[PDB]
Design an enzyme around this catalytic site. Structure first.
Site, short mmCIF file in Angstrom:
data_model
loop_
_atom_site.label_atom_id
_atom_site.label_comp_id
_atom_site.label_asym_id
_atom_site.label_seq_id
_atom_site.Cartn_x
_atom_site.Cartn_y
_atom_site.Cartn_z
N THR A 8 0.92 -1.32 -0.06
CA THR A 8 -0.12 -0.10 0.09
C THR A 8 0.91 1.16 0.07
O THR A 8 1.86 1.51 0.55
CB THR A 8 -0.98 0.10 1.15
N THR A 9 0.38 2.23 -0.66
CA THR A 9 1.21 3.51 -0.71
C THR A 9 0.10 4.72 -1.07
O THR A 9 -0.78 4.74 -1.67
CB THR A 9 2.00 3.68 -1.83
OG1 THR A 9 3.21 2.77 -1.65
CG2 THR A 9 2.61 4.91 -1.84
#
EC number: 3.4.25.1
Lengths: 223, 222, 223, 222, 234, 222, 222, 234, 222
Positions: free
Chosen positions: I1-2
């Site tokens: 995730t980012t």
């Protein structure tokens, strides 16, 4: 320990052995492991003997308490649910060495067909229950041998007497292949106990008939 | 498993059961646990079956090897020492669950009094040995029950046949109080094996005699 | 420690040794291990001495408390159930080293046949109780040897005196095979204690009778 | 197990019990724990029975081997050193439950005063040794009770007979206060063994004298 | 630490040493370990010193509290039961290194025979109590040596003075065989404390009598060593 | 255990196997794993059988309880939230071995387009939920094989019958690649159970249709 | 995995399943577990597949090596001893999960009675071996179910064909009760493999006969 | 990592991806995982990259060494045995995280039927080997997805080109379902490597053919996504 | 995730990826990770998906609850304090494997200068908060790569559109260097979601604009 139950047309029969052991030492020779909880159900419990006796006593007390309070006996599914709840609650003690696995055999009076009113319910360590549809079930250390014997002998069951003979022979095989299960003791005259349930209720099988069946089986297997 | 040995006037007798188990499951019904190592000694080994068979085979090989090399059989003390050395060397494997405790019975030809030439030797897990002076000894899981039965029954031993009957009854009691010890199987006709040693050597007891003794005991107790 | 109990026609007799040990050192030589809990029952407890004394005292107090509160003594099965409950509740402390294994013998006044009114009950660590049908039982470290001796000697029991002699001989055998069990000390004149229960109630056996029986046994085995 | 040794004018005496146990269960009733290693020394070993027997046998073999090879027996200090070396080398196995603590008593032929030629040597688990100067020593589980009894009873020691009586009484006290030490068995007629060493060498005490002393002590305490 | 108690015709006597240690170091030289709980019982406690003092004080408080509340002192068995309950309650602390083993000696005024009214009670770690009826008992690290000495010396006890001498000699032997038990300190003039209980109650023994007995015992031991030898060698 | 669900134009279908195992042994052959919680949702739970049955019963009871109390059924998102909360609350028991992973399929009456009212919701062990927008989902030990089969077979789905056939074939593949998933038992006549949900509500598929589809698939692959 | 063996008048037969698994995943469907070591013995090995194959290869190599070197094949007892030695030597690796439990069936040409020349030998994890005398034995995860089925069905064995049918039925029962044992796969046409040994030697059973027997059993149980 | 191998009439084909990872980080984008060990066998290794390269190098060296020493190449069973021995000997290091699972594809010239001379062999961590009979096998983290895709797509395999397309599509599915497997990189122009073995020996597939096959597969997937719907909704 | 967030003149833009994984397997492809908590703040949470969704829901509920109770929305510092309290309270669950790291971006209505009213707040595992003054921030597994890309690309930000392009390119780089971060899916048409906050409130960015930017970036890098 080994307790077997099988269905026959018009009822159900449950039988169990008489041996209790502490390791390799034999501590008991006349232990009774099959109990009549009420007029139409019988319960057999395997594992620790003290936990089995306590479970049977508490289950019978609870069923009779409900019957007296409400004026009407519990439905069969209600009895199954109560026993499953008790088994689920005993999980922590079972993990500590006080495991107890029950086996429920009963006659459903409210069932539509009287010839298929026999019921066999098996329980696991997590409290799950399953209604057996194959006609037989067994619990205990020698349960696998008894079930494998009944898988071959169940085609001979046509009424109560043949079912009782098949149950006695399955117990004999289980005691033959398992040291923790005691076989027919001809020296002391100690034989397995059995309960037969039909439309007229659950009654205890007299020792003489079981002795005759055991002697017949022993003579057949001797040659 | 249970192996018993007792002295009678003029010889010694050793007997053992036939059952071998894997936990609570019965895996063997005709195992022979009493061996004739040579003409005057018999060895019964309790514990793991594989280790017992290997020990009996190796012990017989060693004794016969010495006898052939030197042209003279070992003394009884030498045989005791060799068996104790084997037991002591098996300690590391025994600590891993491969324990094997042997029981030795023999007839000393070099003994002074022929009537007291019988010998019974017991061994512990540390390799120590002790010559039994009470006239009977037992090894195995049901050894305590058989020994306590022989304590009461030893007064009836006056010859080889009475000693054999007492040994069979002790094995019957051990199997009666122990699930790991097998009793006389009347359905399959399997009975405990026994060896009788006297001045004429060591011979195997025929199955018919042991069957008759076991049936007599069963009829007496029923 | 070793406590033996056996049935004779018309009653029951219980006997126990007098030695207490702390490892290999002998700390006590006149410990009393058989108690008269009420007029028709006797209790022998093996294991930790302090726990045994506390169990006997608490059990007697509870039985007398119920009898005074309700004006009628408990039935024999009620006493068995209470003792089993106490043993079951002591399991957690028993796992820590404070183990107590009781042995209950009593005479049932409400029994049908007076000659078969004797009762012997054995308990396990889980609280399970079993009414003995063989006619004898033993608890303690030397229980196995005493039980094996009683197995060979029980055929000689025909009255109270023969039963007492058999119990004394079984204790002698147990002390002969167990170092934790004390034998008849002729130097100090200390002998095992015994209790005999019959239709007239439970009475203590005088030391002179037990000493005479022990001397007879010792002289029998000396030649 | 309890082995005692005390010095009397003109010699030394060593005695030991006969019981061997496996936990609380009695396994042996006539075990001999005092050995005559050579003509002037006796060795008693407490602890594991098998290790004790092996140590006594190996020590006697080593001493006799040196005497045969050199044609002259070892000095008493040499014997002490060899026994200490054996005990030190057994330390690793003793840490595994195979402990063996020996007690050494001997007569020094090369000593100046013949009346004080007796020697008592004790050993620890680390191989250290010390020559006792108080006249008595004991080893085993019941060693403390026997030493405390000998402390009070040593003033009565004036010859070999009184020393033997005191040793028997100390063994009786040790068996009275310790369950692992066997007392005089009047039923079976089994009594502790004793060895007396003086200028004429080491001899085994006849069983009848020890039986008489034990019966006298029992009647005294009855 | 070592506390001894023995019965003599007409009463009972209890004595204890004066040394307290922290490992091998000597931290105390005049510690008192024998207490007078009430008019007819004396209690000696071995083990941790703090737990011993606390137990003695609490036990005396409980006994006097019951006596004041009810107007009648507890029976001897009641006192035994209360002490056993306290010992059993202290089991958790004993398992953690705060062990305290008491020793109860008393005189039973309600006993039938006045000459045999003395009582000695011994306790274990589990709270079990046994009324010792062999005439003597000891507690502490050096208890075994003192008990074995009293086994040989008990035949000389005929009255209070002989019993006191035997108790002092047993303590001397225990200190002789145990480093944790202090012996008679002649340099500092410190001697074991003793309590004598009889039909007239429990009274502390004056230090002068115990000093005289200790000096006599030491002189006897020195003379015996001078007379005795290692089978002929000194 | 393997439970599959897939969307078809106008509804959704869910099916599951019938086998329950205890290690390698087969203990159940007619276990039902797909439940009709209410008129428009069906729930299938994998993992421990006892926990699955308990969860299904409790979830149905809670939904009916809310409907009776408020006089209006819960919205679909509310049912999702309740099931997610139950899964999250079972986390401690799941970490001990009582793991249960549910699979929710339902029909949204309040949805705008009737043809796209089918809903499939997947859950993880941490209670997280996601509405699948790909048209199919599977849970259980054989979930991967069933999902990979549905990925290739989903292009053939045009109505309820084709969707049911695809679900049965996916279950057949899962049983073909996983021993814990039971295939169509022709000897005993036991076949997987399926539920079809559409605008008229949720109904149980008769066993005869599933048997016909399974036999057709077996003939195709023979 | 399940390998069965039973004796019939004049020979012996051995059969095994075809499935190999990795947990609950089926990794093999046509594995062969019964090997013809030489002209009169067949060996089936259960446990880890790699260890089983290596054991069979090494055992056959050793037997052929001895036969070529000495110009005479080993006696049956020698073959038993070599296999037991291999099993005993593999104990350390079996403790790490590389367990292999072999089953040995052979025909003794040196036996007196030709009709009783069949031999069945079973082995344990400790290297111990026992010659079965009840006429049948099985190894593997499903060994118990197959053995209990053979116990009931052994009365019907009268020749090679009946024995083969009984072995196939026992394997069918073992697969019916154990998920790690594969049953007759009619879709792929994969059936268990069997070997028949008699006076003429050991031969592989053709697949058609086993397929016919399996189909007959399936139709009987339908 | 994912390596696939399938049989087609007249030969065999093996292909593998290009991605290598260290946890969740991408460390390699053009790793070659399929090697030509000799003129008729190809070997792909899954697991640790260093162990894979060393395994392939040592296996090729051993096979060539035997061929040069004896003047005749090993039989296929001999090569299988040598690879199995290497895998078995690597078990101790594999238990420490240095795992290597090989996949072997070959063309047996000594086989009777030329059309069925292709061979596929799979190995486990214990050194065991099995000759695949279903005509396809896969190893790696994404092996399950590729094998399941090949199970459905194997009916289309009729020659070398169709088999290559099926292998590329299986690798595409494995990369689509597994993050440790790299898909066709259109931005960088990096595509999976493939080796095809037939009667003429083992040759490397040119990158253009694999690139256009992957592009066609991507176009087909995009078209199917455009055509399809979530049961009625897109 | 980012999840990335950067400041541009007149507002702030936050964007995040769409991929959720379970180890190496891809379990989700269209997960939404940026939430519009209220009219002027957006929250992005990285870590476990379930914990992130629950945190966003609970935070929005708390903010709206306070606004309804007091009739006035919380100040920005109050919102920061409440989020920090929630993160600090989740520490015990985070240590067990349920970590959730939020990222708060908002527009301060009560700020003095409208052009610098954008706010970016980052949180650590201990609940500490820091108002970022560098102009950009990122959280998640690929946060470092995105921050390093923004460090070079931030000089091109002059308005909302350029900031959105920079955020999309930073997410592209993070997905390029991190396998757990999902990139633009041109086969399924799935693109990262973004939220733009300015004086008129917070609005969701339409998918067509983000698709145009992603295609432009891909064509630029091809």
């Amino acid at each position: 320990t080994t307790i077997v139950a099988l269905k026959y047309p018009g009822g159900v029969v449950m039988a169990g052995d008489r041996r209790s052991t502490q390791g390799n030492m034999i501590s008991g020779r006349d232990v009774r492991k099959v109990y009549i909880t009420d007029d139409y159900t019988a319960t057999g419990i395997a594992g620790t003997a003290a936990v089995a006796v306590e479970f049977a006593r508490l289950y019978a007390v609870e069923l009779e308490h409900y019957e007296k309070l409400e004026g009407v006996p519990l439905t069969f599914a209600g009895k199954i649910n109560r026993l499953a709840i008790m088994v689920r609650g005993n999980l922590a003690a079972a993990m500590q060495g006080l495991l107890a696995l029950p086996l429920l055999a009963g006659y459903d009076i409210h069932a539509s067909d009287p010839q298929s009113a026999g019921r066999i319910v098996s329980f696991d360590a997590a409290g799950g229950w399953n209604i057996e549809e194959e006609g037989y079930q067994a619990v205990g250390s020698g349960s696998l041998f008894a079930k494998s014997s009944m898988k071959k002998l169940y085609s001979q069951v046509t009424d109560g007497d043949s079912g009782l003979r098949v149950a006695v022979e399955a117990l004999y095989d289980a005691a033959d292949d398992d040291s923790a299960t005691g076989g027919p003791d001809l020296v002391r005259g100690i034989f397995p106990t059995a309960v037969i349930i039909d439309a007229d209720g659950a009654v205890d099988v007299p020792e003489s008939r079981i002795a005759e069946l055991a002697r017949a089986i022993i003579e057949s297997r001797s040659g």
